[PDB]
Amino acid sequence: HLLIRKLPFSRLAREICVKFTRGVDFNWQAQALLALQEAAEAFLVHLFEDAYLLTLHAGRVTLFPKDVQLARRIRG
Amino acid sequence: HLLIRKLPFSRLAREICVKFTRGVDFNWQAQALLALQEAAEAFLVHLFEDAYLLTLHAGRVTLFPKDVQLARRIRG
Amino acid sequence: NIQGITKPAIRRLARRGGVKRISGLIYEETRGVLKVFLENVIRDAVTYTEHAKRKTVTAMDVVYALK
Amino acid sequence: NIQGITKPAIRRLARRGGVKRISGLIYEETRGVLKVFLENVIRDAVTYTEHAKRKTVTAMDVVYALK
């Protein structure tokens, strides 16, 4: 169940793709964009959980960017 | 530069291997055992660093098992 | 564009992630995190598309880039 | 056997890892961490050895199990 609107997520994806391809035209299967968004979301969610065990670990209850950054740093 | 003595590390490795193979005889190239130990050490060292950023993150300066366990949990 | 990922979406994602309260600075942080991830995956998806001589990014193409 | 990984070795490893002070309970924790890692890698090294019809674990065999 997707928490980001499909259209904002799709514009982004296209902008990103276009800033990489920079002129080479590619099509995206609707099922490619969808799979991507699942993965995009599912990554944010696990990343949020890990960063939150860090928060808790620091005695706090409010997620800080340093929680998210430590988590990423520990993932590699 | 290896911080665990090669012989204690080798007995262990053999015991582990034997508890898996459980009768099937395999030989270890001296360079297999060595490569293993490098990896064994290098893993402990990175694991120690990551767990220590956790310690620091908790305001502390003393590494606790919970630091090591969180780190592993965040690695997956 | 990136500001098109909205504050509310970020909180739902965090909520689903078990986060209870969040700093105001999470919003822009979370956007930084998603721009980078999308750039990595997309660049790879497209590269494998391109490699196979196609011009249409598939769902196994994306799935490869995740791997 | 596992108690054959000595307190001093664990501190040198931690020191190299930048740890400054450590709890007494690190020792047994670090041993648990190494037994598991060794069991994963070794079991894989040996499995790939076995697969290739050899009876001698090589250095690329170990290197595969790390991958």
Q: Cβ of A53 and B59 within 8 Å? A: no
Q: How far apart are CA A24 and CA D29, in angstroms?
A: 53
Task: Copy the structure tokens of residue B69.
Answer: 């366990």
What single DSSP character describes residue D24? Answer: T
User: Phi/psi of residue A27, each to 5°?
Assistant: -100, 150
What single DSSP character describes residue D5? Answer: S
Q: Does A38 touch chain C (CB under 8 A)?
A: no
Resolution, angstroms, 1 dp:
2.5
Q: Cβ of A70 and B58 within 8 Å? A: no
What single DSSP character describes residue A23? Answer: T
Task: Copy the structure tokens of residue D33.
Answer: 């961490």
Q: Which residues pair with B24 in a beta bridge?
A: none
| Residue to substitute from B21, B37, B46, B48, interface D, most D β-carbons within 10 A | B48
Fold (CATH) for D1-67: Histone, subunit A (1.10.20)
Half-sphere exposure of D60 (CA within 13 A, CB side): 2
- Do D and C touch (≥3 CB pairs < 8 Å)? no
Q: How far apart are CA D23 and CA C16, in angstroms?
A: 35
CA distances from B11 to B8, B18, B33, B42, B74 (A): 5, 10, 11, 19, 31
Name chain A contacts of C23, Cβ cutoff 8 Å.
62-65
Question: In this structure, are residues D5 and D34 in contact, taking their beta carbons and an 8 Å threshold?
Answer: yes
Chain B: residue nearest A58 by CA? B58
Experimental method: X-ray
Q: How far apart are CA C22 and CA C2, in angstroms?
A: 20
Helix locations, chain D, DSSP H: 7-16, 26-51, 59-66
Structure-token match 């099937």, residue found: B24
Q: How far apart are CA D28 and CA D24, in angstroms?
A: 8
Buried b (16+ CB within 10 A) or exposed e, A52-70: bbbbebbeeeebbbbbbeb
Question: In this structure, are residues D10 and D30 in contact, taking their beta carbons and an 8 Å threshold?
Answer: yes
| Residue to substitute from A15, A36, A57, A67, interface C, most C β-carbons within 10 A | A36
Question: In this structure, are residues A26 and A14 in contact, taking their beta carbons and an 8 Å threshold?
Answer: no
Q: Cβ of B74 and A53 within 8 Å? A: yes
User: Phi/psi of residue B19, each to 5°?
Assistant: -80, -15
Give the DSSP letter string of B8-75: HHHHHHHHHHHHHHTT---EE-HHHHHHHHHHHHHHHHHHHHHHHHHHHHTT-SEE-HHHHHHHHHHH
Q: How buried is residue C8: exposed, middle or buried, by Cβ count under 10 Å (0-12/13-18/19+)?
A: exposed
Which chains reach chain A with 3 or more Cβ–Cβ distances below 8 angstroms? B, C
Distance from CA of B76 to the nearest CA of A (A): 9
Buried b (16+ CB within 10 A) or exposed e, A19-44: eebeeeebebeeebbbbbbebbbebb
Q: Does D25 touch chain B (CB under 8 A)?
A: yes
CATH code for A1-76? 1.10.20.10
Q: How far apart are CA A30 and CA A27, in angstroms?
A: 9
Distance from CA of B20 to the nearest CA of D (A): 7
Q: How far apart are CA A64 and CA A41, in angstroms?
A: 19
What single DSSP character describes residue D4? Answer: G
Q: How far apart are CA A3 and CA D65, in angstroms?
A: 38
Q: Does D61 touch chain B (CB under 8 A)?
A: yes
Question: In sequence order, what are the residues at sequence separation of 6 or more whose Cβ sits closer than 8 angstroms to the Cβ of residue B24?
Answer: D50
